[PDB]
Design a protein around this nucleic acid. Structure first.
Ligand SMILES: [Mg+2]
Ligand SMILES: [Zn+2]
Lengths: 104, 251, 156, 292, 131, 145
RNA sequence: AAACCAUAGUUAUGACGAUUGCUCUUUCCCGUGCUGGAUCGAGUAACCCAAUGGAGCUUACUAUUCUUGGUCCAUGGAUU
RNA sequence: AGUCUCCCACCAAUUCGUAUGCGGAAAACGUAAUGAGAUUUAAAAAUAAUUGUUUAAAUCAACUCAUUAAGGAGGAUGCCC
């Protein structure tokens, strides 16, 4: 395998994985969400390339693995509620009933 | 070192019966050894998060499979009792008369157009399917396909040890290690198909319609699809026996 | 000297070992056999299979995992009746890990009895056992040093 | 199903040019084999390992299955495969099997020495191990090596067609075949006929009688000629055409278009298979329900 | 309460791949016997020559030879080995074993030579079982 | 799975074929007149060649090829005319029949080849040969009286 | 200078003949059925072989190249 | 069969004086109840022995590791009663 064609194959595979991690089932089906999340992370671990922390912070859920999304393609919302602080800022979802809170 | 050797030869001709053997079979050691024989915190956090997400997703997939398997049976029995053959009729009927049982059933009509095209475009750009077909490379394309990802792919069972598994087409939702998960449709069939890989032959066709109507005829083999590299290369392969493939030639 | 030093250990050379000592071997053979020393036949007989044995390994032994784990427990770390047996097994495991070679080879590195302070623990647990209200003259007093008493049941 | 994998080609070195009489005799013997009855025939091309191999690809295969054999097959009705036997005696440095294995289909060996035999059994990626039944055996064949090689792949080949050559050769042929059958535990045995003319060919029953007189049972002979021959053909076809047994470019819809069976359809200058669209997403999954 | 194998039939046929020579040169019944004796003597010694066999229904390159059940292997191994050289034709001849039978039930044509052979062996089979 | 060998012990006996000389009728006299001696022109490659010729002449081509794979003369001396030939366990009867069918030597006529003991080991063959040699001396000592 | 000792003992366990039993298939019978009976046949395998004795573990075996018991949120057909 | 382990002399004790889940003289030995784990791990892989494939990675099944000392008495709960 040539290195120039291997790099391109790598970016193509990463693009395809992130694209499949999006549209209908990774949003709706929490099972497939977690599955494709695990697959993408096992694929990025094998290449040993660091991931951008800016997105790594608020990337996905930790209980099921759906994209944290509040309310050209009308889709499902990931996060149903996002309160103020009320003591401290938190975010909740629909797919499961757990919530993740961060401190200012 | 002739004399002491001759003396120990005369020494062996007393104990042993053939004195010249230990030197030829190398049984007289010249030497004998005398020695007693002799930024971490976020890493932990993300590893725990990934382990938890994996452990949850496994149970979620299991429960989804169980729910689908029960709902297919229930809806099929209700349809058979309900005097209903068509799918467009049963779907609307269970919509108006069974609200909850409809949120669990899947909708293949939306499972086709998203998955098929997003996989076809990716495979077309990966294998470099161009308007012209004079820029191909067979071995390199085979290596890429062995390294390629098959999540969200359409595969057809063309040959199998069981005479009933053949001819099944479906789009996969997850790639397991022993079983193969797809979804099939009929007039009233919406079965989630779990098919064994030990002794089956699959195939996938890529449509090419630049000017003419052409398609590539590719195929995979489950028996040896378990010991392949994933997403990369550089893994020591072993010749297994190349003998348990008799069903391929038999029929 | 028939032996030599090395970077690894001390090795023995058979060649000089028997070449230097030849007249002694001749004298021994003439002292053992007087009429058959000049002859050349087979004198010594093969070993009987009944007396033949088998060869073991060159290692010491392998400790069980349970005893090793309990030794690790004890080394790293009014009284009820079970706390008596606990302390007794604790001193037994300390003595084992101290003397036993297999346990030592199964112990983790950078761990010795001095750092673990076995002696003070032994003393404290022996103080506990002597506080455990032992009734020695109720057990019995025997006659010899090796355990040998009489087990005779009259009408029972 | 009968397979004959040892049809010799009238050429040993690339310096030779084959005349028309030899290819006509080969045509006659192929027609003879088709007359009485046969299913698969793979011709052999023997060459030596010591001399330099030409640095070409489109000149390494002097068989031309498409031009003459492709012209006769539509009238005959069978398929032909190209096989090469590497006769290796000493471990010389000339070794470029990565090209010959990919250009040919089946690669066999003919060792003369013990070191060459060991290296071909362990490291050399080959398909069949043939011994010189004309000459004597190199040394005493052991059991464990042959059994581990059979479990690992490569099997032994017995050439009963050589015994029809000379008078003194039959004794050495039998002395080698009996030793091979005794040392191979009668597991990995494939039989072939090394005849250069249709005059030394026989029927399946004659082969069965000869082999059962040699010492191997008849049912095992039929089993090895039926399934062990198809499997050793499939091995050499898939290791070259496909990848290391993971992805195959051949798709068997029914029971006739198989990677070893379908030879005129599958392209060879490349590995593509241009077929019209027969699988879309709107068709019913259940084949019993799917109707056109 | 069993059956004793008297002999076994063997369907032989001289198969030479030259019609220009086959239509010209003729083959009679003594040629077959001479070829058999020569094959036995070239492949074996007296052991092969002492094989009991007869000739039944000799035709143009077609013959039926009965060989004892004890030396069926010795017969079938020498048949598939020898090739005639300079016996009666400049073109070498070889024989191909069509089929074998041990119960006299075999199918070629609608002739009656098989029928009278079966007559004789019927009045002899009942005789051998009765005696 | 295991190479099974089988050795054959054979002896050369010369019958007193002489009708002009009357003979004594007893045990040891005929034992001595039958075990007189072997001629000078006697060797191992000369007996192996003769038995190979006889085997090829009586059995045939394949019959000699199957037996000549492990056909060797291990021990033989012309002083007593006792030889030990190695062969396989499958073709042992063929080798015995060839020894029986031995007509004559190329230069020496009027001799018989007698197979005495056959077994799959050389130790028991040597033991039986020693027993036979010891038994031979008994009738000799008895008749010398 | 021997300790020499095996209900195989030092790489021997050979040559065939006969009888019973087991698997499936071919047919008959009483009462559906029976570890039912009787013919017409095939098969009785594969892995492999001791060299002083015993126990534990792992690894090879049984596809017209003998068999047996159970299990399966494996699929295929039918009834409720 | 196998480059695996151990017994085939004792030692009121520098001699594994080891009452440690059960059986066992020992075993790099069999099995039982619970919890967890997957080059992101205690440790198996894509930078002592054995095996062609050589644990798992929907659920089950299989491997590894981490705990549960023997006997008698009192109270509570569940089953026939
Ligand atoms: Mg052994
Ligand atoms: Zn969630």
């Amino acid at each position: 395998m040539n290195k120039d064609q291997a790099e391109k194959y790598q970016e193509r595979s990463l693009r395809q994985k992130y694209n499949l991690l999006h549209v209908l089932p990774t949003l709706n089906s929490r099972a497939l969400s977690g599955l494709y999340y695990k697959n993408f992370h096992n694929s990025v671990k094998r290449y040993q390339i660091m991931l951008p922390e800016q997105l790594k912070s608020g990337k996905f859920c930790s209980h099921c693995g759906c994209v944290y999304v509040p309310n050209g393609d009308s889709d499902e919302l990931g996060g149903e509620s996002m309160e103020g602080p009320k003591k401290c800022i938190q975010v909740n979802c629909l797919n499961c009933e757990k919530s993740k809170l961060f401190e200012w | 070192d002739r004399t002491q050797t001759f003396i120990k030869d005369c020494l062996f001709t007393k104990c042993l019966e053939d004195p010249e053997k230990p030197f030829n079979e190398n049984r007289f050691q010249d030497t004998l050894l005398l020695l007693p024989t002799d930024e971490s915190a976020d890493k932990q956090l993300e590893k725990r998060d990934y382990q938890r997400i994996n452990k949850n997703s496994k149970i979620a997939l299991r429960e989804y499979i169980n729910n689908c398997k029960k709902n297919t049976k229930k809806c099929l029995k209700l349809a058979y009792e309900n005097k209903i053959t068509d799918k467009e009729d049963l779907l609307h009927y269970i919509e108006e008369k069974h609200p909850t049982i409809y949120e669990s059933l899947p909708q293949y009509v939306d499972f086709v157009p998203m998955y098929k095209e997003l996989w076809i475009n990716y495979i077309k750009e990966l294998l470099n399917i161009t308007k012209n077909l004079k820029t191909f490379n067979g071995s390199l394309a085979l290596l890429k396909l062995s390294m390629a990802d098959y999540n969200g792919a359409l595969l057809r069972v063309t040959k199998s040890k069981n005479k009933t598994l053949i001819g099944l087409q479906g789009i996969v939702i997850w790639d397991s290690q022993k079983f193969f998960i797809m979804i099939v449709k009929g007039n009233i069939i919406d079965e989630i198909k779990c098919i064994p890989k030990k002794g089956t032959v699959f195939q996938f066709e890529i449509p090419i319609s630049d000017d003419d109507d052409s398609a590539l005829r590719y195929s995979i083999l489950g028996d040896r699809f378990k010991y392949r590299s994933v997403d990369r290369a550089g893994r020591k392969f072993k010749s297994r026996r190349c003998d348990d493939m008799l069903y391929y030639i038999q029929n | 000297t028939p032996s030599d030093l090395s970077e690894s250990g001390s090795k023995l050379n058979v060649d000089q070992f028997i070449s230097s000592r030849q007249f002694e071997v001749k004298q021994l053979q003439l002292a053992m056999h007087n009429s058959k020393a000049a002859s050349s036949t087979r004198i010594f007989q093969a070993l009987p299979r009944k007396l033949r044995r088998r060869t073991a390994s060159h290692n010491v032994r392998r400790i069980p995992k349970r005893m090793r784990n309990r030794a690790l427990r004890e080394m790293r770390k009014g009284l009820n009746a079970k706390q008596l047996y606990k302390a007794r097994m604790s001193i037994k495991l300390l003595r084992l890990a101290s003397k036993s070679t297999s346990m030592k080879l199964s112990m983790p590195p950078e761990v010795t009895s001095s750092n673990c302070h076995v002696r003070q623990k032994i003393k404290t647990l022996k103080r506990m056992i002597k506080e455990s209200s032992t009734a020695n003259p109720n057990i019995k007093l025997l006659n010899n040093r090796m355990g040998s008493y009489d087990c005779t049941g009259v009408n029972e | 199903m009968l397979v004959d994998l040892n049809v010799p080609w009238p050429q040993n070195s690339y310096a030779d040019k084959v005349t028309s009489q030899a290819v006509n005799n080969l045509i006659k013997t192929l027609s003879t084999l088709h007359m009485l009855g046969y299913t698969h025939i793979a011709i052999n091309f023997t060459v030596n390992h010591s001399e330099k191999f030409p640095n070409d690809v489109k000149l390494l295969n002097p068989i031309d299955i498409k031009r003459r054999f492709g012209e006769l097959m539509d009238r005959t009705g069978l398929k032909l495969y190209s096989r090469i036997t590497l006769i290796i005696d000493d471990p010389s440095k000339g070794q470029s099997l990565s090209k010959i294995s990919q250009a040919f289909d089946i690669v066999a060996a003919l060792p003369i020495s013990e070191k060459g035999l060991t290296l071909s059994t362990t490291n050399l990626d080959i398909d069949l191990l043939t011994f010189q039944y004309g000459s004597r055996l190199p040394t005493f064949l052991k059991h464990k090596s042959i059994c581990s090689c059979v479990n690992r792949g490569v099997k032994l080949e017995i050439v009963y067609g050589y015994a029809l050559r000379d008078v003194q050769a039959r004794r050495q042929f039998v002395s080698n075949v009996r030793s091979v059958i005794r040392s191979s535990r009668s597991r990995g045995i494939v039989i072939g006929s090394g005849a250069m003319s249709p005059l030394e060919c026989r029927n399946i029953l004659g082969v069965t009688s000869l082999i059962k007189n040699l010492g191997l049972p008849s049912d095992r002979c039929s089993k090895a000629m039926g399934d062990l021959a198809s499997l050793v053909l499939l091995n050499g076809r898939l290791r070259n055409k496909s990848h290391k047994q993971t992805i195959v470019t051949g798709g068997g819809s029914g029971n006739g278009d198989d990677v070893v069976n379908d030879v005129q359809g599958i392209d060879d200058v490349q590995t593509i298979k241009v077929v019209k669209r027969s699988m879309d997403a709107e068709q019913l999954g259940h084949a019993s329900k799917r109707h056109k | 309460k069993k059956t004793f194998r008297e002999w076994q039939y063997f369907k032989l046929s001289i198969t030479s791949f030259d019609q220009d020579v086959d239509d010209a040169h003729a083959i009679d019944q003594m040629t077959w016997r001479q070829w058999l004796n020569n094959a036995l003597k070239r492949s074996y010694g007296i052991f092969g020559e002492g094989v009991e066999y007869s000739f039944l229904h000799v035709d143009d390159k077609l013959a039926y030879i009965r060989v004892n059940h004890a030396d069926k292997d010795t017969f079938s191994s020498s048949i598939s080995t020898y090739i005639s050289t300079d016996e009666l034709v400049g073109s070498p001849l070889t024989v191909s074993i069509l089929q074998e039978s041990s119960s006299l039930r075999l199918l070629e044509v609608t002739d009656d030579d098989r029928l009278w052979l079966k007559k004789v062996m019927e009045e002899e089979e009942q005789d051998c079982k009765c005696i | 799975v295991r190479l099974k060998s089988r050795y054959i012990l054979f002896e050369i006996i010369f019958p007193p074929t002489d009708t002009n000389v009357e003979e004594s009728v007893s045990k040891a006299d005929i034992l001595l007149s039958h075990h007189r001696a072997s001629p000078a022109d006697v060797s191992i490659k000369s007996i192996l060649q003769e038995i190979r010729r006889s085997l090829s002449l009586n059995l045939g081509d394949y019959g000699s090829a199957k037996c000549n794979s492990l056909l060797q003369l291990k021990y033989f001396s012309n002083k007593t005319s006792t030889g030990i030939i190695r062969c396989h366990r499958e073709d042992c009867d063929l080798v015995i029949m060839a020894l029986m069918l031995m007509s004559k030597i190329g230069d020496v006529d009027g001799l018989i080849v007698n197979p005495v003991k056959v077994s799959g080991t050389i130790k028991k063959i040597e033991q039986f040969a020693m027993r036979r040699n010891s038994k031979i001396l008994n009738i000799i000592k008895c008749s010398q009286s």
